[PDB]
Design a protein around this ligand. Structure first.
Ligand SMILES: CN1Cc2nccc(-c3cn(C)nc3-c3ccc(F)cc3)c2C1=O
Length: 291
């Protein structure tokens, strides 16, 4: 099928937040692309909003380039450069075990991606391994951030007025990586994207989280059980046996005030100092490169 005169639509290759992913080719450029399709008439249309966020994010390191946006037949279409597997696919491919060097190489880039989105007045709100993809070819060392479907402006683009403190909010994101504030129903802000990343890094270290795979009757009761398990698990217990930096990272995120600008530099330097004490080289040789 033809997409915006220039793109050739192929078979389905993946599943996305509110629209499936298809293989494509930019016929004029001779380059493969990923095409996200969303039904023109749906009770919850979100592709168009997401496109605007990606467009605002353009030029940022690890921000996927959007080649085209439009409407074709029964669908709203978004065309992105082709990327590699997500950190979840790579984690499963690596038998759910990442070396400390891989976790630290990933932590460095992931903190930067989040800082970039924040510099562009947005909070991601769904920080999880599935939303970070590795690039391909010459970009194979680069971690990309995707899925702006739950992203929200946290401050006014010009005035920098932070959004007001709100309570009794709905769990926006994934329960496994949600911050304690989110479980409490507090409006998400910059600190919450970073706390989620802290749980993602501990998840890479452990293979799973202590509140993962809890037995429950309803999805709301599962969230209550996860909340309870997260609030009953001290950071030192969660991080036992791993370098103290992971715990320091999580304690710092939990200490942040609602409208505080996080010290991203300090957080990257925490892991960089550990990376150097370990004698590792920033050579971008991840565990999967040794397979
Ligand atoms: C298998 N692949 C490769 C590949 N490359 C690039 C992005 C994705 C991809 C994965 N998800 C969950 N969403 C997207 C996507 C997003 C916006 C778009 F405009 C197009 C695609 C994939 C993919 O699913």
């Amino acid at each position: 099928l033809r997409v915006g005169n220039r793109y050739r639509l192929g078979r389905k290759i993946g599943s996305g937040s509110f629209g499936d992913i298809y293989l494509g080719t930019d016929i004029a450029a001779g380059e493969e692309v990923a095409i996200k399709l969303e039904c023109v008439k749906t009770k919850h249309p979100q592709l168009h909003i997401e496109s605007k966020i990606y467009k605002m994010m353009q030029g940022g390191v690890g921000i996927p380039t959007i080649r085209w946006c439009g409407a074709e037949g029964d669908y709203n279409v978004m065309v992105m450069e082709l990327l590699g597997p997500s950190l979840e696919d790579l984690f499963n491919f690596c038998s759910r075990k990442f070396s400390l060097k891989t976790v630290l190489l990933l932590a460095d880039q992931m903190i930067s991606r989040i800082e970039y989105i924040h510099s562009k007045n947005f909070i991601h709100r769904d920080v999880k391994p599935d939303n970070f993809l590795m690039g391909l070819g010459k970009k194979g060392n680069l971690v990309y951030i995707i899925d702006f479907g739950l992203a929200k402006k946290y401050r006014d683009a010009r005035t920098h007025q932070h959004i007001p403190y709100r309570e009794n909010k709905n769990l926006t994101g994934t329960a496994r990586y949600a911050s304690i504030n989110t479980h409490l129903g507090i409006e998400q802000s910059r600190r919450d994207d970073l706390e989620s990343l802290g749980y993602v890094l501990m998840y890479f270290n452990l293979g799973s989280l202590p509140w993962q795979g809890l037995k429950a009757a309803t999805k709301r009761q599962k969230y209550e059980r996860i909340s309870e398990k997260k609030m009953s698990t001290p950071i030192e217990v969660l991080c036992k046996g791993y370098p103290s930096e992971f715990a320091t990272y999580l304690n710092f995120c939990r200490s942040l005030r609602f409208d505080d600008k996080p010290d991203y530099s300090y957080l990257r330097q925490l892991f960089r100092n550990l990376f150097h004490r370990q004698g590792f080289s920033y050579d971008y040789v991840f565990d999967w490169n040794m397979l």
